[PDB]
Amino acid sequence: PSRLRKTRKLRGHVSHGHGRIGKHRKHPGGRGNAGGMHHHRINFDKYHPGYFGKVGMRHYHLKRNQSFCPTVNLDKLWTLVSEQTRVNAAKNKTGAAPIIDVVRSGYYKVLGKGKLPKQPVIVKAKFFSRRAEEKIKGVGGACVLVA
Amino acid sequence: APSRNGMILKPHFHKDWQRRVATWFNQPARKIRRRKARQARARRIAPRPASGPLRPIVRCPTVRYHTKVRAGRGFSLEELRVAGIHKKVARTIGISVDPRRRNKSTESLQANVQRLKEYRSKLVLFPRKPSAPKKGDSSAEELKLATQLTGPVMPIRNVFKKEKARVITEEEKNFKAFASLRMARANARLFGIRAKRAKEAAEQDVEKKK
RNA sequence: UGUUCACCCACUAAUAGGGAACGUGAGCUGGGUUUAGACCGUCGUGAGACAGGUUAGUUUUACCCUACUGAUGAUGUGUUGU
RNA sequence: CACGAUCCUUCUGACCUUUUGGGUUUUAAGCAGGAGGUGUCAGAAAAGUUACCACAGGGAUAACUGGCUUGUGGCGGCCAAG
RNA sequence: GAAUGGAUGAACGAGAUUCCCACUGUCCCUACCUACUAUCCAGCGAAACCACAGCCAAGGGAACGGGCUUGGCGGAAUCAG
RNA sequence: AAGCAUCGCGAAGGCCCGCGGCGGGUGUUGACGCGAUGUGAUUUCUGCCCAGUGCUCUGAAUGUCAAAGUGAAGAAAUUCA
RNA sequence: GGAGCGUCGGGCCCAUACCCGGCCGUCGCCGGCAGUCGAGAGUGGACGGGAGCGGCGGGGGCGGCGCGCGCGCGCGCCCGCCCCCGGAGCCCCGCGGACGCUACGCCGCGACGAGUAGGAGGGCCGCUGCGGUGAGCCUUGAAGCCUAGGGCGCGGGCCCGGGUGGAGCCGCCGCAGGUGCAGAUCUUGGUGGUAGUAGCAAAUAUUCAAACGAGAACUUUGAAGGCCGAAGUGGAGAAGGGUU
RNA sequence: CGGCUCGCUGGCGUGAGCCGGGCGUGGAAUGGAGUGCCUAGUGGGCCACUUUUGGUAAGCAGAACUGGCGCUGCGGGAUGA
RNA sequence: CGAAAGACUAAUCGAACCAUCUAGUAGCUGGUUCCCUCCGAAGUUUCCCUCAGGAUAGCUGGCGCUCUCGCACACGCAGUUU
RNA sequence: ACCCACCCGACCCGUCUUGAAACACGGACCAAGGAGUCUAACACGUGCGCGAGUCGGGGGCUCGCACGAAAGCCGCCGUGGCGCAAUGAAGGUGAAGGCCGGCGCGCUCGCCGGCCGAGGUGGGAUCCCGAGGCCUCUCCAGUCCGCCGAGGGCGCACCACCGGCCCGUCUCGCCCGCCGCGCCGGGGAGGUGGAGCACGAGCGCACGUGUUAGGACCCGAAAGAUGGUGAACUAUGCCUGGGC
RNA sequence: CGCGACCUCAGAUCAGACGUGGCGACCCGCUGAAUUUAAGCAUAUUAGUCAGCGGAGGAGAAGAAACUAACCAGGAUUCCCUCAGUAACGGCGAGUGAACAGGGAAGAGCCCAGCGCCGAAUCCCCGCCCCGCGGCGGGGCGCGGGACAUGUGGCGUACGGAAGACCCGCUCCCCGGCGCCGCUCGUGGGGGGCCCAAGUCCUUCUGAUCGAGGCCCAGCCCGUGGACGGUGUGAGGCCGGUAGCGGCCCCCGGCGCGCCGGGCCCGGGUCUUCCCGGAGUCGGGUUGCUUGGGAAUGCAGCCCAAAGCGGGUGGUAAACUCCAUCUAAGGCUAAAUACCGGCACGAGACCGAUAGUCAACAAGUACCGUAAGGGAAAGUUGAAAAGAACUUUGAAGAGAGAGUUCAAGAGGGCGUGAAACCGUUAAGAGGUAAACGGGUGGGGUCCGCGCAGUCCGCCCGGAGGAUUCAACCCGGCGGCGGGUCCGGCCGUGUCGGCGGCCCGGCGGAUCUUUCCCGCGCGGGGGACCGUCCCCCGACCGGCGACCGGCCGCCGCCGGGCGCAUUUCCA
Numbered sequence A: 001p002s003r004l005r006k007t008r009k010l011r012g013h014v015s016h017g018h019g020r021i022g023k024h025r026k027h028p029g030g031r032g033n034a035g036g037m038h039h040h041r042i043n044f045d046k047y048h049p050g051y052f053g054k055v056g057m058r059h060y061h062l063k064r065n066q067s068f069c070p071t072v073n074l075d076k077l078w079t080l081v082s083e084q085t086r087v088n089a090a091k092n093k094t095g096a097a098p099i100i101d102v103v104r105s106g107y108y109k110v111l112g113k114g115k116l117p118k119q120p121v122i123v124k125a126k127f128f129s130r131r132a133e134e135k136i137k138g139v140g141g142a143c144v145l146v147a
Numbered sequence B: 001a002p003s004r005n006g007m008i009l010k011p012h013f014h015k016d017w018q019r020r021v022a023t024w025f026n027q028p029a030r031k032i033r034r035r036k037a038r039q040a041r042a043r044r045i046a047p048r049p050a051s052g053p054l055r056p057i058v059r060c061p062t063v064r065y066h067t068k069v070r071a072g073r074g075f076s077l078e079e080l081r082v083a084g085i086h087k088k089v090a091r092t093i094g095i096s097v098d099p100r101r102r103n104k105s106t107e108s109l110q111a112n113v114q115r116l117k118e119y120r121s122k123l124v125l126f127p128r129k130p131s132a133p134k135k136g137d138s139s140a141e142e143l144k145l146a147t148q149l150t151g152p153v154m155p156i157r158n159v160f161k162k163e164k165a166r167v168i169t170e171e172e173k174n175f176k177a178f179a180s181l182r183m184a185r186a187n188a189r190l191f192g193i194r195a196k197r198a199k200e201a202a203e204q205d206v207e208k209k210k
Numbered sequence C: 001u002g003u004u005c006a007c008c009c010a011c012u013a014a015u016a017g018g019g020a021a022c023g024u025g026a027g028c029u030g031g032g033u034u035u036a037g038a039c040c041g042u043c044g045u046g047a048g049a050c051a052g053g054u055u056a057g058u059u060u061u062a063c064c065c066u067a068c069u070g071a072u073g074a075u076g077u078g079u080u081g082u
Numbered sequence D: 001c002a003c004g005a006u007c008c009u010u011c012u013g014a015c016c017u018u019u020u021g022g023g024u025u026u027u028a029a030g031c032a033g034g035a036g037g038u039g040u041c042a043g044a045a046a047a048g049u050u051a052c053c054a055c056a057g058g059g060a061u062a063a064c065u066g067g068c069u070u071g072u073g074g075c076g077g078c079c080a081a082g
Numbered sequence E: 001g002a003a004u005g006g007a008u009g010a011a012c013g014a015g016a017u018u019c020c021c022a023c024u025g026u027c028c029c030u031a032c033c034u035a036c037u038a039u040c041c042a043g044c045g046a047a048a049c050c051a052c053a054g055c056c057a058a059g060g061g062a063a064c065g066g067g068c069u070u071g072g073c074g075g076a077a078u079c080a081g
Numbered sequence F: 001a002a003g004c005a006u007c008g009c010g011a012a013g014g015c016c017c018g019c020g021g022c023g024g025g026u027g028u029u030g031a032c033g034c035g036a037u038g039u040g041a042u043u044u045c046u047g048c049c050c051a052g053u054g055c056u057c058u059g060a061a062u063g064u065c066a067a068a069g070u071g072a073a074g075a076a077a078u079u080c081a
Numbered sequence G: 001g002g003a004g005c006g007u008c009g010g011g012c013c014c015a016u017a018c019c020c021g022g023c024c025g026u027c028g029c030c031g032g033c034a035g036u037c038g039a040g041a042g043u044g045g046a047c048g049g050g051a052g053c054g055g056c057g058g059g060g061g062c063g064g065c066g067c068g069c070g071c072g073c074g075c076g077c078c079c080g081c082c083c084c085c086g087g088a089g090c091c092c093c094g095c096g097g098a099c100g101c102u103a104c105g106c107c108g109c110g111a112c113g114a115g116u117a118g119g120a121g122g123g124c125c126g127c128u129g130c131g132g133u134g135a136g137c138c139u140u141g142a143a144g145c146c147u148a149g150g151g152c153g154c155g156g157g158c159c160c161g162g163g164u165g166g167a168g169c170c171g172c173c174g175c176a177g178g179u180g181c182a183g184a185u186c187u188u189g190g191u192g193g194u195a196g197u198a199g200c201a202a203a204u205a206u207u208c209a210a211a212c213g214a215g216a217a218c219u220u221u222g223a224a225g226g227c228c229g230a231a232g233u234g235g236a237g238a239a240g241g242g243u244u
Numbered sequence H: 001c002g003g004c005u006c007g008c009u010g011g012c013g014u015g016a017g018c019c020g021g022g023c024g025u026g027g028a029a030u031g032g033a034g035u036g037c038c039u040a041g042u043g044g045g046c047c048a049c050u051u052u053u054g055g056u057a058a059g060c061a062g063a064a065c066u067g068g069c070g071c072u073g074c075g076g077g078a079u080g081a
Numbered sequence I: 001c002g003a004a005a006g007a008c009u010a011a012u013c014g015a016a017c018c019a020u021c022u023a024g025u026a027g028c029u030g031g032u033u034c035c036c037u038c039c040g041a042a043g044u045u046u047c048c049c050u051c052a053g054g055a056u057a058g059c060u061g062g063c064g065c066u067c068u069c070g071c072a073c074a075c076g077c078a079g080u081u082u
Numbered sequence J: 001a002c003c004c005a006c007c008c009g010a011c012c013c014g015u016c017u018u019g020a021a022a023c024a025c026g027g028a029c030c031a032a033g034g035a036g037u038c039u040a041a042c043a044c045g046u047g048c049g050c051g052a053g054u055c056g057g058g059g060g061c062u063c064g065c066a067c068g069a070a071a072g073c074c075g076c077c078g079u080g081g082c083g084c085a086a087u088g089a090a091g092g093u094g095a096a097g098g099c100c101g102g103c104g105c106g107c108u109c110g111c112c113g114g115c116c117g118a119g120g121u122g123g124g125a126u127c128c129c130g131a132g133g134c135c136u137c138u139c140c141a142g143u144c145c146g147c148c149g150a151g152g153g154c155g156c157a158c159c160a161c162c163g164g165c166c167c168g169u170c171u172c173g174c175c176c177g178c179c180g181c182g183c184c185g186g187g188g189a190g191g192u193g194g195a196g197c198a199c200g201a202g203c204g205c206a207c208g209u210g211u212u213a214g215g216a217c218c219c220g221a222a223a224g225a226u227g228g229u230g231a232a233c234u235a236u237g238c239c240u241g242g243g244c
Numbered sequence K: 001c002g003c004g005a006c007c008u009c010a011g012a013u014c015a016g017a018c019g020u021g022g023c024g025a026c027c028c029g030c031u032g033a034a035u036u037u038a039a040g041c042a043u044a045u046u047a048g049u050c051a052g053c054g055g056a057g058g059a060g061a062a063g064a065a066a067c068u069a070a071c072c073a074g075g076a077u078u079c080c081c082u083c084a085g086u087a088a089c090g091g092c093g094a095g096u097g098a099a100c101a102g103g104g105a106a107g108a109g110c111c112c113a114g115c116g117c118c119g120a121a122u123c124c125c126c127g128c129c130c131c132g133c134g135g136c137g138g139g140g141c142g143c144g145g146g147a148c149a150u151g152u153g154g155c156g157u158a159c160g161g162a163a164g165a166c167c168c169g170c171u172c173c174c175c176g177g178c179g180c181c182g183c184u185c186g187u188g189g190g191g192g193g194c195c196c197a198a199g200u201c202c203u204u205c206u207g208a209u210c211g212a213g214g215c216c217c218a219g220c221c222c223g224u225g226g227a228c229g230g231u232g233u234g235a236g237g238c239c240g241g242u243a244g245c246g247g248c249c250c251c252c253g254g255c256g257c258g259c260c261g262g263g264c265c266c267g268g269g270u271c272u273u274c275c276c277g278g279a280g281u282c283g284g285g286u287u288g289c290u291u292g293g294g295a296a297u298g299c300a301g302c303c304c305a306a307a308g309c310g311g312g313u314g315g316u317a318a319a320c321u322c323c324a325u326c327u328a329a330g331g332c333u334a335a336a337u338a339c340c341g342g343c344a345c346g347a348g349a350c351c352g353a354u355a356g357u358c359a360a361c362a363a364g365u366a367c368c369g370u371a372a373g374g375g376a377a378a379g380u381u382g383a384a385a386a387g388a389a390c391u392u393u394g395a396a397g398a399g400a401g402a403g404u405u406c407a408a409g410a411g412g413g414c415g416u417g418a419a420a421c422c423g424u425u426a427a428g429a430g431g432u433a434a435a436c437g438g439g440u441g442g443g444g445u446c447c448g449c450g451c452a453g454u455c456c457g458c459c460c461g462g463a464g465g466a467u468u469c470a471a472c473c474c475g476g477c478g479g480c481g482g483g484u485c486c487g488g489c490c491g492u493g494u495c496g497g498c499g500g501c502c503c504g505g506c507g508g509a510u511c512u513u514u515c516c517c518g519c520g521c522g523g524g525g526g527a528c529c530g531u532c533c534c535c536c537g538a539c540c541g542g543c544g545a546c547c548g549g550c551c552g553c554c555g556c557c558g559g560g561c562g563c564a565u566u567u568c569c570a
């Protein structure tokens, strides 16, 4: 919508909002990220601390899927399963504890943020945190490694 | 020139890109054309599935996909050999065959034999002439269907086995997972040197004798 | 002497001093400065340099407005002439 | 006051990390601290000439006039030792 | 200052100087004449240039005004210069 | 410009072209010639300077001087000779 | 005998400054109004017993918190009532509520208003096309054009009258953009002043009569006077032209 | 005021940090405050009072301080940043 | 190509002309289209092969939010003074 | 609003500039044309939908498309993107604490049972409780309705401060674990680096402004590069003719 | 010095074939800048991009792993989405920059050399006959030529293959013709032709209407047709079309059946014995280019130069070592993909004659340039030419009358006809260039009046005329509002029915395989939970969600009411 834009309101005025002392010349700074070291340095090193320089190790044929390891927190572990597993449990009276295959739901690691409700579980997962393990045991459950 | 905060960003419009802009005003016209051509091909292969041939079940590669299962390119030779379909014939009954597939584990093999067996059950081979010889099915299962199969033939559905609620034996509860993982990491790490030091120590024991 | 300036001869009453975009190039002239051609000296490895010398080198337009010069006329006095 | 970023090099440091299908060893690559310098000292790697010259501009800036000033030049007082 | 050539030198030069004789309007010092113009007329008929325009003195002013301030003043339309 | 004076070359050569060729120009040529520079008819001269920058001559007597090749140690990349 | 200079009076002169008033806009007000009492607000109302001229017998405070338009009252007759706006008649009305209320509306009080570069808001300002919508307009005259006609708007602009014209065009709500010019030694086209001006001056030269003809300075014929003066203004080619 | 905490400090004590109570206008004048995001133009300046450096001085060059002009009309200063 | 003047090479030569790369780049000239309303600057900072430009502070606008109470019942802030 | 008169006022615009009526440039006049665009990427603001999710592409199913190259639908609804977790160069690791009771010597360390469950200080719009008024036509009783409300509380968001947790790192220390007792693995205390956590705010769509890359507001070089055309002029050589 | 084989080479206007140039949007192979960015510049970038050369096809190229990976593993090529502005490169600056996996579009796989077996079992050309002949083919017959053992053809190629013995089960696939049947998706494939609904109805405007009003239901008639165009304005019905699984005729394709001519004796498993791979290539060194590819991603030249349990890859140089993974140095292959050139169509929130292509027109034209090349301007009378007969002035161009046209105030460069600028006509002014702002005056032009503008409207009082009613009941209709929620429909929250629950379905990682069906899994039942529906009673919000009676009120029509009422008029 040109109708709404600013150039409609600038019609009539000479400079078109670019001033008349200094003008709208083509590329007064240099094109683009020109002068990162010289003559634009201050902007670079007060809004991009650490642009310039190497750091760390190269890694040639990176393939991301090798390092694939999506995490989930205890916080919302019960979310993976239907409420009626968490309900048929705190009930039942066998002391059963329902299984939660986390790898089925698409998380490999189980990290340990959050309060887990006092209600036993069997968490199957590829990897665990230390704390996530501990919390799980404290609920009265069992962590289970899977390949 | 940059002005107070923003991504120091690199656009790739320095070559003559407007010479190679590729618009998509086709796409509707395209989508139709494919669709017509699709419906034509069905009609040509008259009672044969529109899909194509039947294709194997197959697991993806890499740790990432790993858990999922797709359709593969074609059934291996072992899978045809065990099912008892002559490879040259299998092409003629709508069974995809690749021959470059290895077959590592017997769980993936027996599944894919089972597939072909099931296919052969629910297949309606018409006889060559209207006069009916062996193999060719009855005119009952022929009149009741010279019907095409819409969609992929015997589709693969990645499926899960429901685990019932156990009781947690004092042993599961005993397990120290995180520790176990740390241990298992370090033993892979240190396997190799440990073996070299033991090889050193064995040489020192033998060197003591001489 | 391109000179401004300078000096000398002569006359004279006297050979005072200045200004006008250092009056005055669609007024001239173009000798000199100050393109390009060339020579010499000094300087520069060199291309080249030199308020160092030399020689050769295109000086456009007015019919507009004004100003000035002269030329017909103009309003008035009824018209005309004296 | 007496000093120097990124990149690169070099040395020192840990039973350190990586060197990619796995293992051992050399090698290399990282991590951390010093050194090798940028004096145009917040840090290009860099000789002239053009009178054969060009282009973008500048009265932000020279070479005339004209303004301001009058040191300097020119001209004129006052005092009065001579 | 010596083949970055030195010194010379008859002949030659639309080459650079200086003097003398002759000759002359170069000048003292200007004048008269001729032809073609310019001029007036018939016919024909362009261009550059052009903010608006077009009388001065002084003032101030981006420090030399046609326009501003204060004074002088101002009379159609034109011709040749 | 004639005149003078240097310099290179005896042809698998001097000088030069060409993108390339058992290519081409000088050259249908051979030092009284081809090629490269200066000075500039004649006359008369043409001093000294080989430190500098050039050019050139010699070359196991010899400092440095690359790739290959030779040896060396190393498991090898290699390093050193 | 100032229209000079120094010291001082009264008086008068006028800026867009100051004061009062009008009108426009902006800002602010916990602004007001979806329908109610109420102007330093400092209550209103059940309802029960006991009673009545009683009351709440508190500061030269000069007073606000308490008093003289009634509390009980006139009527029905010491007892009853002290009644209902579909009717008190109203300055307040709690029974229902604008002429007003497109709540992006309407209304009230104050204050304030220079502006380049620049920023933002609003434009029932303007251009062209699209979805909607105006039972829109139009040969009984669309667009455009022109107008010493009538008006509106602060303005961008707009609307009507008349003329001209001869086929299409507009209002509103949305969307869209190749959307508004005085300048760019801007581009393309057109037109002036300059101007009936400069100019139609290289190479000696024309004159008389006639013919044709609407018409003769210039054609043609005749006569005269002139020039080129065989290195020609003569007589023939080459190239080039291409029907001259 | 009352009490707790300390791995600090130390003859005992410091000093700090915590809880729990108890007390209200603490000079004049004025004014509603705080706070966060996007952000253009600008980065040639000049002038006056006073102060002030260079300079014989300048409508010269250079600082300070405030206020101007620039961005700004209006009355006065005849004319005028 | 030049008996050398940087001469000449189709009115073009200190590098011809034609088409393209090409809408070449420009810290530099020039221009940059309707109305009202409200707010309204800077020419100073540090850095820059920086000094006719950028960066960065500053100065401007816009959007807000959080609270305050003239609804007899206020805290904080200042180009002052005490 | 057309013309004329008169008094007062009044230099020509545009532009660069500290300064323009300038003896600064551009501009004789009129018409039409004529310059901040579009794409991509980012950021912030705003509007809408859904919300620990969101998403639509790409693909597919529904039609000869009149309107359609639309519209609709999809275990593709989610392959996947962004988001929901960081931190380390990396190997890797990865956001909880409190309290109570018991057992280990409570050793501000190690292990076993119960309860609460995102800490605390100050300020915080707002809610909540509310002594007490303040009247009612009388003396008291007395529920109903307000108005205010001293005093006291829960305290959103947000801010400041102090605690805590996660990753990197250092320093100091003492214990645990077992299929592999090891140059194995795990924890503690105290600092200190992190674009962290501390009951989530994102995703998609749309508009606006700003900043960039692109012809990038419009106009402007001197140059540079590739491939072609010319010696009809002129330069020089050669061939064949002419002339003095 | 003969004749004859072959080998290597010539020549033929020998017989018969092919290749040459073009186009170039897309495609394949080379070649290859510089403007530009970096605020300078040389590496980098621009860019393997423009220009240059080569060669194609309807597509091209690529392609059946010397692949990915490191998994529980995928499995040719191309294309899209994603990966990802990521890993990486880089004066680590500017900047640049992939791949695998994952999801899709599509989907298709094959053949030699070799090693071997088979009397060369093979091929080409001659010549005679039968068919067929506008894509030169079949069949037969020839002591008719030649190619070929320096290797043709069948079997066979790594997914293994061959040959053998017995286990099994049985025998259609192809082409040259000749016919014939069903015209075979935009709903009869492709092409061609020719066809198919309804007003010129009534009035009326007009130069002419396709307009405006009407016409048994917005009017008549068709409507599977109201797209579009044309026709003297604006047309579903005047005409061409448009709609339609509408028609007919041609031709051609494609597929179905029959007959003939040929070819063709074409399997699989099981055990044994044999068989097996492309050299100046890989690989190394190198130099140069190239790449994100980094101690060398790919291509090159030069030098070296292999092997066979080898070789290649396994993204950091090397040695040792295990694993994994392909099988290189020969070849063919549709498809999804591309398409600013061509032929033929369709459309548009585009432009509307200084725009849009250079070009709406006798445009790559005229014109320029030696040449390469450059390159315009330019649309519109009217419905119809009805384009002005004739008279007259003039040598004529030009006029004046006349005429045509609705109009020439449309006259052949003619629709409309702005401005600059000019002519005239009218008015007004005039020595400080004009022009301008503010303020008045004078004159003009028109515009509104008034031949009193005393402007209207309520209510009232009076005097004159005027018809009918208000008021009042009565009968009818319609509307509102109300509570008794009275009676019934209606729906919110709650409770009761466990009643829909199987006569109520979906969802669930809840359960059960006591079930059923199909092969521990899939589908369906069967429990269970969550969610959505029937039955009646009770309480409550009695809600604009409605009905029925009753009430009250209002309004209209019709009755009555004749005149102290009732309106009208002046």
Ligand SMILES: [Mg+2]
Pocket (backbone or CB within 6 Å): A017, A018, H040
């Ligand atoms: Mg701006």
Ligand SMILES: [Mg+2]
Pocket (backbone or CB within 6 Å): A014, A015, A019, A020, A023
């Ligand atoms: Mg400007």
Ligand SMILES: [Mg+2]
Pocket (backbone or CB within 6 Å): A022, A023
């Ligand atoms: Mg700027």
Ligand SMILES: [Mg+2]
Pocket (backbone or CB within 6 Å): B051, B052
């Ligand atoms: Mg498919």
Ligand SMILES: [Mg+2]
Pocket (backbone or CB within 6 Å): none
């Ligand atoms: Mg002079």
Ligand SMILES: [Mg+2]
Pocket (backbone or CB within 6 Å): none
């Ligand atoms: Mg003069």
Ligand SMILES: [Mg+2]
Pocket (backbone or CB within 6 Å): C025, C059
């Ligand atoms: Mg002159």
Ligand SMILES: [Mg+2]
Pocket (backbone or CB within 6 Å): none
């Ligand atoms: Mg001279």
Ligand SMILES: [Mg+2]
Pocket (backbone or CB within 6 Å): none
């Ligand atoms: Mg000279």
Ligand SMILES: [Mg+2]
Pocket (backbone or CB within 6 Å): none
């Ligand atoms: Mg004259």
Ligand SMILES: [Mg+2]
Pocket (backbone or CB within 6 Å): none
């Ligand atoms: Mg290995």
Ligand SMILES: [Mg+2]
Pocket (backbone or CB within 6 Å): D051
């Ligand atoms: Mg010179």
Ligand SMILES: [Mg+2]
Pocket (backbone or CB within 6 Å): D051
């Ligand atoms: Mg010079």
Ligand SMILES: [Mg+2]
Pocket (backbone or CB within 6 Å): none
């Ligand atoms: Mg020269």
Ligand SMILES: [Mg+2]
Pocket (backbone or CB within 6 Å): D059
């Ligand atoms: Mg100056």
Ligand SMILES: [Mg+2]
Pocket (backbone or CB within 6 Å): none
């Ligand atoms: Mg000398």
